[PDB]
Design a protein around this nucleic acid. Structure first.
Ligand SMILES: [Mg+2]
Ligand SMILES: [Mg+2]
Ligand SMILES: [Mg+2]
Ligand SMILES: [Mg+2]
Ligand SMILES: [Mg+2]
Ligand SMILES: [Mg+2]
Ligand SMILES: [Mg+2]
Ligand SMILES: [Mg+2]
Ligand SMILES: [Mg+2]
Ligand SMILES: [Mg+2]
Ligand SMILES: [Mg+2]
Ligand SMILES: [Mg+2]
Ligand SMILES: [Mg+2]
Ligand SMILES: [Mg+2]
Ligand SMILES: [Mg+2]
Ligand SMILES: [Mg+2]
Ligand SMILES: [Mg+2]
Ligand SMILES: [Mg+2]
Ligand SMILES: [Mg+2]
Lengths: 107, 57, 53, 78, 96
RNA sequence: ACGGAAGGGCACCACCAGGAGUGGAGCCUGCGGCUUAAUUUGACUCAACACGGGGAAACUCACCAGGUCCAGACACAAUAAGGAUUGACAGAUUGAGAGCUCUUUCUUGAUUUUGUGGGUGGUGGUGCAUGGCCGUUCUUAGUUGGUGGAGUGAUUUGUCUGCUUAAUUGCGAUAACGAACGAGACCUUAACCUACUAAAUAGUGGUGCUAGCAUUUGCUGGUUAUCCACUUCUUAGAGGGACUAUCGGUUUCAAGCCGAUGGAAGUUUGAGGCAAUAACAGGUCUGUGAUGCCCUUAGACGUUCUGGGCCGCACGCGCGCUACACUGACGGAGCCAGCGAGUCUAACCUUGGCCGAGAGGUCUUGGUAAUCUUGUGAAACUCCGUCGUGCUGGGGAUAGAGCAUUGUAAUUAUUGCUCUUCAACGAGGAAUUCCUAGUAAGCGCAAGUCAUCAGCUUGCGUUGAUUACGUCCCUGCCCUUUGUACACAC
């Protein structure tokens, strides 16, 4: 409760890299002036969701195909912080379009 | 395409002044919905027993 | 009181339909869209699927 | 509830597309323009971008808690 | 064809209890969520309400959104035998 | 607009030089025809014919033979509580353990029935009534106006002789001047970064700790409060980098073009995404709870259930798979990808052990995933052998017997496996397609479809040519001049 290590991992997933990198920057900064020992934001390979469809609602025409894409960007940060203050600072100001998962480890 | 719904009165109950007490045979059993049922040909139509019915008359 | 009103629809075409139009044909099942190809085209932008290359 | 990130973010897009069409069909005379979904911990807030924000809110909150009831009932939200 | 009065009551009371119903357009579903009756029953009961008024109906992706009307609240409260205007039924209930 | 008029251009959906083929065989698959109870349909040059994401056992399904049900709102007039209506055991009947209908007598209770209106549904009609979308003209390079100039006018110039470009891209010429759309720019992706930010979900070196060797350090197995360090390789954010740079040649010495050097990169750096105006009676009413109108709506063209058909086979055509062998087949050994996908929102991707010739089974495991399947140990390929020019140990159609798996169900054989049968086919006619560099071609793999099923498609990597950097001969398209009695425009 009083200055105790937590072994936290904050996993950030999104389809919008700009805001995903804003939240990542906010986390790293809040670790910085709070003097943490943190493992920097690890960027996982982008996942490209591809859907290939015929363009024509019927079947007539030249056989033209479309490949729609969704890009999923995944990052995660590891922190060793007291639970109360980081919970207060990270529960709040959750930017839209970014899914945040905070998980405790026993490593 | 149904029963005629004729003006049926109470059946299986004979009278009340039948020289001189009420005469209703087939004393009250555990079938209240007592009540009289269908007999087709040595059979009775299971009307209330959702689980068990072991009786023949 | 109706035992004759249902035949198995657990697998195959008849077991699935578009969540938008209820069509069993051209259905996209990747990632659990369960939308037909025509409706996906008309709705890909606000699902998050875009054309880049 | 134990879903992969791929299928989760696809479902989130499909949720948005259905919400958008529902509001398009319901909020016609209300001048509905678009919708935005912010998912915060313990609460998901749905912002409806509309021209006349009076009739969409009805009187004392009419047609906005009706919509909240409909949205949570279709999408199984507590 | 028909519909038991108990099921029609348990749908009307559910409708009046919060003002809205959502029913997936799936006949044969045999169980609506949070209404103890057939999905076909809720769809047709609410359709009978809609045709005579009393209810607004919107479809939107196979799901049958149903809303009570200000004139159908009076009919439902007379139907369910509830105190007159004592219970709004139940839109303006807590937050106000 | 058209021309069996002249000129100029452009383009491997044109040709030249060639490569691989296709057309010939057997199979697969779509189409017509024939057959049929039905063999549901739409589309017919490019711009129909592995297309409708169309790999149909049921479902899908629209068709055929049948059987149910109403999921016919609502309003009005009757029908009823001396009961408008509902549902059934058993038997007959029925494909049926459908009370469908009868026999029967129970059950239920203005929830319904009948008629009238009025609704609803419909993969019913009409794509020549429409919307949306898509395809095509055309991915070509084209379109438009303000002011000015020409003309009574419709119209015209600008928007062009030439040169140049992939480009109406430009340089120029110039009664035009300055502009807008389109092109380009842009965006995504591929290639470079020992420079930045960091990583036990990526990797590497030491070793706290070891450890197994053969040896005395080469190969390796292990732990990150059962260690230290780092970022080259991987990842992805921010940036940088190319601008055809430099030099030479050539050009009306301009736009540009060519060569060399350098460079990760010099074909618009490669490939794509988006993509103007005006149109087509192009396709789709069978994607849509898009839709007008017509048709139908209870003995239904609504919906469901059972069975069947969609696959039916004198035949004609299209996309294809496998081949005709030794640049090979077969056996053994070597043995290397990239793009993916994946279950508790229920059985998905499956390691390992065991069993079985095999297909497969079985007991566990890990993975909601840079973590585990998975180093997807892929095939072609490489090496060593067997065969030896024989329709042969090429080829694997057809067919028999059996073992399995998916599924409610496999017969008209779902598919797989085993043994057996061992056809045509000896390189393919007239004709015809695609293609210029990591391309063609060969080779597989993942994904879509998907319970099962790919000989299909969409992508991905592996191996990796030959030929030409051109022309207007053929074909098509565009432009200019010209002729027209065409404008429903040859
Ligand atoms: Mg040639
Ligand atoms: Mg051939
Ligand atoms: Mg052939
Ligand atoms: Mg059938
Ligand atoms: Mg002018
Ligand atoms: Mg002009
Ligand atoms: Mg432009
Ligand atoms: Mg451009
Ligand atoms: Mg690096
Ligand atoms: Mg047309
Ligand atoms: Mg067929
Ligand atoms: Mg790999
Ligand atoms: Mg032989
Ligand atoms: Mg052989
Ligand atoms: Mg054999
Ligand atoms: Mg099949
Ligand atoms: Mg196909
Ligand atoms: Mg040709
Ligand atoms: Mg003449």
């Amino acid at each position: 409760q009083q200055q105790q290590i937590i072994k936290i991992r904050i996993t950030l997933t999104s389809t919008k890299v700009k805001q995903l990198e804003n939240v990542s920057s906010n986390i790293v900064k809040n670790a910085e002036q709070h003097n943490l020992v943190k493992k920097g934001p690890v960027r996982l390979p982008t996942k490209v969701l591809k859907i290939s469809t015929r363009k024509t609602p019927n079947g007539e025409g030249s056989k033209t195909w479309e490949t729609y894409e969704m890009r999923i960007h995944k990052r995660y940060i590891d922190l060793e912080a007291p639970v109360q203050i980081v919970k207060r600072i990270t529960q709040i100001t959750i930017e839209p379009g970014v899914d945040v998962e905070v998980v405790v480890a026993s490593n | 395409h149904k029963h005629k719904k004729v003006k049926l009165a109470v059946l299986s109950y004979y009278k009340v002044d039948a020289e001189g007490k009420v005469t209703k045979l087939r004393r009250e059993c555990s079938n209240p919905t007592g009540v009289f049922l269908a007999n087709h040909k040595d059979r009775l139509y299971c009307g209330k027993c959702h689980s068990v019915y072991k009786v023949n008359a | 009181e109706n035992v004759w009103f249902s035949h198995p629809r657990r697998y195959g075409k008849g077991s699935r339909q578009c969540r938008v139009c209820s069509s069993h044909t051209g259905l996209i099942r990747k990632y659990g869209l369960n939308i037909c190809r025509q409706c996906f085209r008309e709705k890909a932008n606000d699902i998050g699927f875009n054309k880049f290359r | 509830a134990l879903i992969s990130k791929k299928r989760k973010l696809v479902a989130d897009g499909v949720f948005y597309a259905e919400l958008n069409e529902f509001f398009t069909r319901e909020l016609a005379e209300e001048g509905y323009s678009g919708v935005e979904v912010r998912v915060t911990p313990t609460k998901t807030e749905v912002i409806i971008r509309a021209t006349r924000t009076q009739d969409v809110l009805g009187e004392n909150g009419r047609r906005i808690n009706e919509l909240t009831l409909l949205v949570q009932k279709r999408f199984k939200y507590a | 064809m028909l519909m038991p009065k108990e099921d029609r009551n348990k749908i009307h009371q559910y409708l009046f209890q919060e003002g809205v119903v959502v029913a997936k357009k799936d006949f044969n579903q045999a169980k609506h969520e949070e209404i103890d009756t057939k999905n076909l029953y809720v769809i047709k009961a609410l359709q009978s309400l809609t045709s005579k008024g009393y209810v607004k109906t919107q479809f939107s992706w196979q799901y049958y959104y149903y809303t009570l009307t200000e004139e159908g609240v009076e009919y439902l409260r007379e139907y369910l035998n509830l105190p007159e205007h004592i219970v709004p039924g139940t839109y303006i209930q807590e937050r106000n």
